[PDB]
């Protein structure tokens, strides 16, 4: 009964930036890990960055640490993936995806998920 509420992707130019949002509800505790995962066609989903919301702990894939930055909204069940330098290789489907503890987070296997935010990346 999680709910998550993604929004923020579309079709943007290489360098260009974009903003995701996800929000929670449904859940029953008050701090747990929430952030994205992407999926390229026919390949397997790979983390991209987390925070435990209501407080401060970030993780980033280093494929995407020096241009994207996580942020949270604890009163709003809120996370947000500032997406910079666009390159190419970004393009995919990013999922926001929770889990209580961070550390089973970032094995997706008893994640929440949403449904997922085309994000394109055009030359």
């Given at each position: 009964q999680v709910k998550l509420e993604?929004?923020?992707?579309?079709?943007?130019?290489?360098?260009?930036?974009?903003?995701?949002?996800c929000a929670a509800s449904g859940h029953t505790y008050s701090t747990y890990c929430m952030g994205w995962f992407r999926q390229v066609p026919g390949k397997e989903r790979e983390g991209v960055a987390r925070i435990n919301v209501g407080g401060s702990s970030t993780w980033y894939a280093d494929s995407?640490?020096?241009?994207?930055?996580?942020?949270?909204?604890?009163?709003?069940?809120?996370?947000?993936?500032?997406?910079?330098?666009?390159?190419?290789?970004?393009t995919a489907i990013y999922y926001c995806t929770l889990h209580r503890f961070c550390n089973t987070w970032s094995l997706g296997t008893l994640n929440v998920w949403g449904q997922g935010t085309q994000v394109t990346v055009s030359s």
């Open positions: 993604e929004s923020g992707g579309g079709s943007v130019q290489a360098g260009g930036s974009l903003r995701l949002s995407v640490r020096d241009r994207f930055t996580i942020s949270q909204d604890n009163a709003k069940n809120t996370v947000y993936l500032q997406m910079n330098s666009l390159k190419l290789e970004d």
